[PDB]
Design a protein around this ligand. Sequence first.
Ligand SMILES: [Mg+2]
Ligand SMILES: [Mg+2]
Ligand SMILES: [Mg+2]
Ligand SMILES: [Mg+2]
Ligand SMILES: [Mg+2]
Ligand SMILES: [Mg+2]
Ligand SMILES: [Mg+2]
Ligand SMILES: [Mg+2]
Ligand SMILES: [Mg+2]
Ligand SMILES: [Mg+2]
Ligand SMILES: [Mg+2]
Ligand SMILES: [Mg+2]
Ligand SMILES: [Mg+2]
Ligand SMILES: [Mg+2]
Ligand SMILES: [Mg+2]
Ligand SMILES: [Mg+2]
Ligand SMILES: [Mg+2]
Ligand SMILES: [Mg+2]
Ligand SMILES: [Mg+2]
Ligand SMILES: [Mg+2]
Ligand SMILES: [Mg+2]
Ligand SMILES: [Mg+2]
Ligand SMILES: [Mg+2]
Ligand SMILES: [Mg+2]
Ligand SMILES: [Mg+2]
Ligand SMILES: [Mg+2]
Ligand SMILES: [Mg+2]
Ligand SMILES: [Mg+2]
Ligand SMILES: [Mg+2]
Ligand SMILES: [Mg+2]
Ligand SMILES: [Mg+2]
Ligand SMILES: [Mg+2]
Ligand SMILES: [Mg+2]
Ligand SMILES: [Mg+2]
Ligand SMILES: [Mg+2]
Ligand SMILES: [Mg+2]
Ligand SMILES: [Mg+2]
Ligand SMILES: [Mg+2]
Ligand SMILES: [Mg+2]
Ligand SMILES: [Mg+2]
Ligand SMILES: [Mg+2]
Ligand SMILES: [Mg+2]
Ligand SMILES: [Mg+2]
Ligand SMILES: [Mg+2]
Ligand SMILES: [Mg+2]
Ligand SMILES: [Mg+2]
Ligand SMILES: [Mg+2]
Ligand SMILES: [Mg+2]
Ligand SMILES: [Mg+2]
Ligand SMILES: [Mg+2]
Ligand SMILES: [Mg+2]
Lengths: 83, 141, 70, 184, 98, 59
Amino acid sequence: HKKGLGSTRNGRDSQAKRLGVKRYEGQVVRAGNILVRQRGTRFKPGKNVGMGRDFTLFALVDGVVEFQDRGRLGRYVHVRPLA
Amino acid sequence: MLMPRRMKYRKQQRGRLKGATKGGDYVAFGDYGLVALEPAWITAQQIEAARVAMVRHFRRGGKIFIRIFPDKPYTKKPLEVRMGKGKGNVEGYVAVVKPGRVMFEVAGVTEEQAMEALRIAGHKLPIKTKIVRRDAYDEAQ
Amino acid sequence: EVEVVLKPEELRIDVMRASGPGGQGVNTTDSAVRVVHLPTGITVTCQTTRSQIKNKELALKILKARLYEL
Amino acid sequence: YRLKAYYREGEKPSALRRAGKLPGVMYNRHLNRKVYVDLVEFDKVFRQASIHHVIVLELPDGQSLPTLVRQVNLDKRRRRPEHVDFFVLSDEPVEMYVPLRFVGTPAGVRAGGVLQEIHRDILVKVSPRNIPEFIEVDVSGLEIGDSLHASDLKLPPGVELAVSPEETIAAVVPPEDVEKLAEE
Amino acid sequence: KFRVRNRIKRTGRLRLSVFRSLKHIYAQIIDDEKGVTLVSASSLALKLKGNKTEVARQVGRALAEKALALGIKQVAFDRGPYKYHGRVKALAEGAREG
Amino acid sequence: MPRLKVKLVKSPIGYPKDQKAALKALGLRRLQQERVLEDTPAIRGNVEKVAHLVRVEVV
RNA sequence: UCCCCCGUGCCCAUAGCGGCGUGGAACCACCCGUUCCCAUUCCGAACACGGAAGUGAAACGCGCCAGCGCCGAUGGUACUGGGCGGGCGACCGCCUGGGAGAGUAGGUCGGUGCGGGGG
RNA sequence: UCGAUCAACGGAUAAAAGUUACCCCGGGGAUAACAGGCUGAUCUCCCCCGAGCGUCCACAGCGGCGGGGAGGUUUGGCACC
RNA sequence: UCGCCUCCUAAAAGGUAACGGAGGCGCCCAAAGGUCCCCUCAGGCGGGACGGAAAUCCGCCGGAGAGCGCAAGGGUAGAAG
RNA sequence: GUGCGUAAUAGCUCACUGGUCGAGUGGCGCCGCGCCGAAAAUGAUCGGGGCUUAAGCCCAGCGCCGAAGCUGCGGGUCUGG
RNA sequence: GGUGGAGCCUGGGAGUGAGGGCGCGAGCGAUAACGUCCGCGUCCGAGCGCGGGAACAACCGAGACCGCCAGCUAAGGCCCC
Ligand SMILES: [Mg+2]
Ligand SMILES: [Mg+2]
Ligand SMILES: [Mg+2]
Ligand SMILES: [Mg+2]
Ligand SMILES: [Mg+2]
Ligand SMILES: [Mg+2]
Ligand SMILES: [Mg+2]
Ligand SMILES: [Mg+2]
Ligand SMILES: [Mg+2]
Ligand SMILES: [Mg+2]
Ligand SMILES: [Mg+2]
Ligand SMILES: [Mg+2]
Ligand SMILES: [Mg+2]
Ligand SMILES: [Mg+2]
Ligand SMILES: [Mg+2]
Ligand SMILES: [Mg+2]
Ligand SMILES: [Mg+2]
Ligand SMILES: [Mg+2]
Ligand SMILES: [Mg+2]
Ligand SMILES: [Mg+2]
Ligand SMILES: [Mg+2]
Ligand SMILES: [Mg+2]
Ligand SMILES: [Mg+2]
Ligand SMILES: [Mg+2]
Ligand SMILES: [Mg+2]
Ligand SMILES: [Mg+2]
Ligand SMILES: [Mg+2]
Ligand SMILES: [Mg+2]
Ligand SMILES: [Mg+2]
Ligand SMILES: [Mg+2]
Ligand SMILES: [Mg+2]
Ligand SMILES: [Mg+2]
Ligand SMILES: [Mg+2]
Ligand SMILES: [Mg+2]
Ligand SMILES: [Mg+2]
Ligand SMILES: [Mg+2]
Ligand SMILES: [Mg+2]
Ligand SMILES: [Mg+2]
Ligand SMILES: [Mg+2]
Ligand SMILES: [Mg+2]
Ligand SMILES: [Mg+2]
Ligand SMILES: [Mg+2]
Ligand SMILES: [Mg+2]
Ligand SMILES: [Mg+2]
Ligand SMILES: [Mg+2]
Ligand SMILES: [Mg+2]
Ligand SMILES: [Mg+2]
Ligand SMILES: [Mg+2]
Ligand SMILES: [Mg+2]
Ligand SMILES: [Mg+2]
Ligand SMILES: [Mg+2]
């Protein structure tokens, strides 16, 4: 005997987004290289770093990524040139 | 019974039971306590039964402290139903207990009454217990 | 008050083999159930469904009735 | 009271504690050493004593020091201690929860009631030479319901506490009446 | 707190910072990323006329001169709570236009 | 420089890939095979990783 | 070098809150006015201009205090890469590396570049 | 640049519902119904605790709330020959 | 039930299943857009004709608990408001 | 007022003290190994026989046995030199 | 560091797209299933070749070119079979 059952109105979920840091400190990059994918401003653009509409962070020059945590001011991603 | 008035979620994942109580290991209230020796899910109907058992024992007497609280929901599918088609329905609530936890406490009661009391309450619990006194159980600072 | 808690303390529940149609299972499963009330002499049966557990409770859902009337 | 104490070189924590010796450390606002003080006398003493009365600590240096225990971490599963913190002293004024006796009979013990001595070991700020004992309170006036509290007590000259004074020190509440049952 | 800090809008280099005072008006061309002041020109703290605005202009050209001497051609205009008006150092020199 | 002489004594059959590679890195193929290597930190790291399968000798 | 004050930066609460004092010679503020530039969903409060009698009262600066806040060991535990054991299970133990979070002692009412004005 | 609930949303035709106990072929123990098996919630039996019933009097006969097991005859779960 | 978005499951990189847990989208805005210039909330407590227990005033206190068109999350007053 | 006992008393008795005896004592609390709790369906059994200061269990030690694993000797083939 | 049936690039030919047990981490389930879904790892699959485990794909030991009436070991064993 198979006694009938119901179901759930659950079952959904949205595609994975692959957010996060893409280049770490001491890593060489080229102009344009996206360095971080984030939703809010989890990281603030630093020296030679841009930020697109979706808060994406990319290198502005060809240099080596560097990270700086500035307490109450936030965390910064800078791109130090070979200067 | 002995459930929580409100909850952000009605059903919740089962989990696990790694030994050590984390917290609740010393007396801190009454004079004698009942400490859990095996890990387990104590159903509110047991917490209840044990409690009533004590007041019943030393009717018109001391004070009782229930140191645990069933805030975890218990799910159970219907009978004769197959697997799947969603999570079961909540059948009650249980308090998770680990080894070392002082589940109950008593006060303003004779040492005879205290012992006898807790000994009966442990006969209503799905686990093994131990009765204690008070001494280093003074984490006042 | 308005109460009648007939505890399954004086009931005799049986489970004979289904009657009527069915298939390779009407002959095999103890579908049909029969709950008996002894201090009264009332008996209620049920083969409405194809499950003993959905029939002993649905057969009890009646004994509660007739009783509250008698 | 008194008690023997030895110096720990920092070797096999969990072992020195199995062999029978109980681990620990003695510190204060100056120096701080690591030691091992056996369960035998420790236990016996510590229970009679507690963290109210001072103790001696004669090491192989003899150097007997006055102290009160600040921290004693149990073993969770099956009560037992694994560590103890020793606060050395002098004439230096510090704190400590001082024992509490409550001579009396609340009016809450004739028609049902029992005393819940909430904070039965009150913390007070004061120096060594200023270390009392059974700091009693009056209970002869605690009605069944309403009950005493705060620092509204007999603080012998020199008792410069650290309460509120509101910190409910104690209260009297009712019994466990068989009369219950419910639902709905 | 009249916060503002609109000066945080400092992406480039060489900040020409002004300071209006009930009495005087100072100004120094600063270069962060090094945390140093390179050129300075005060109001009556460098001694000057008695007006306020007229004094602004004079202490203006003053700085710019001393500036160019060091090769300080272009900069960016500051004074946080500034409110760009009156005491406007609309000075010649300086390749910060404005 | 003081060298190491590790000997594969316990079979790697049943242990993780990495542990089987460490052995490769060291140069151990068969059971009972011995190999004298330099004592550098990079050579120990792997011998530490496979301690349970190797008998080491400082020579 | 060393002091005091004014601009700025870095550290990003050991910088704070709240008490208690100090400072007007210079700086600075508040002040004096609203002709003028410029201003108010209404206000010269705020912005802005011209000033210069008075005050350091408000604000701000500098000191001292730990009540609140913030910081925070040393020990010992939790947990755990890897290796290994006991049970019948839920689970429990050892070895070898790592090692908190609470809590205790205790710390703190700041540190510091650069440029100006005053001894 | 416009016309898609081509929403079964990588979208078969521009255009499409049922029935078979009158049935048929190719396959599957990749998958149901019997029986077995693993499981033992359900089921049956027995035990721990001692509120309370038994005029008195916890077990002569009973046992509130709760706790631990056995068996593998029931109803199921699983889908292993 | 079928496509898309948010959280969890997810084992501190990314990713990760089940008829697992729980909600949203199939729009909207010529100002809700660009830029320049100003301004800073929610609450709590007092004081105020109509006046709730928040209408609008005043005053201390209030580092963000408000707000950000709509779900959730991340972010945010040194502004995205 | 401990238990028995009464319809409530009575009656027996004890915590308790004298007491000849003239010595080890009652307690509680951990630990190692056992006892009970313990009933299923064709003939039983730890694999069998058979084991008890063990042929069981815990803790030390040395020696042997034991694979197609590793050596020794011979041979083949494939790669690199 | 690391010369390994390592890697990287281009191209010819593929099979596979029913997995399974076990350990650890979760969900689902009843902290049921030789259950079911993922994750890390392993082994069987293809090592039903070998020794141990009474017998037994995946547990312990161990990766079988062939030959030997030679030797040392592994797990497991050393009262008799
Ligand atoms: Mg605590
Ligand atoms: Mg039919
Ligand atoms: Mg059937
Ligand atoms: Mg501004
Ligand atoms: Mg193996
Ligand atoms: Mg102002
Ligand atoms: Mg672990
Ligand atoms: Mg630590
Ligand atoms: Mg810490
Ligand atoms: Mg088409
Ligand atoms: Mg599709
Ligand atoms: Mg068609
Ligand atoms: Mg017909
Ligand atoms: Mg025909
Ligand atoms: Mg016909
Ligand atoms: Mg036909
Ligand atoms: Mg056919
Ligand atoms: Mg076939
Ligand atoms: Mg099958
Ligand atoms: Mg079947
Ligand atoms: Mg068969
Ligand atoms: Mg019951
Ligand atoms: Mg059967
Ligand atoms: Mg079945
Ligand atoms: Mg399957
Ligand atoms: Mg992740
Ligand atoms: Mg992860
Ligand atoms: Mg924009
Ligand atoms: Mg605009
Ligand atoms: Mg308000
Ligand atoms: Mg036993
Ligand atoms: Mg041998
Ligand atoms: Mg050869
Ligand atoms: Mg060869
Ligand atoms: Mg290959
Ligand atoms: Mg190819
Ligand atoms: Mg392919
Ligand atoms: Mg598949
Ligand atoms: Mg696989
Ligand atoms: Mg697998
Ligand atoms: Mg399973
Ligand atoms: Mg399976
Ligand atoms: Mg196959
Ligand atoms: Mg293989
Ligand atoms: Mg076979
Ligand atoms: Mg075998
Ligand atoms: Mg085998
Ligand atoms: Mg081989
Ligand atoms: Mg070989
Ligand atoms: Mg044998
Ligand atoms: Mg051996």
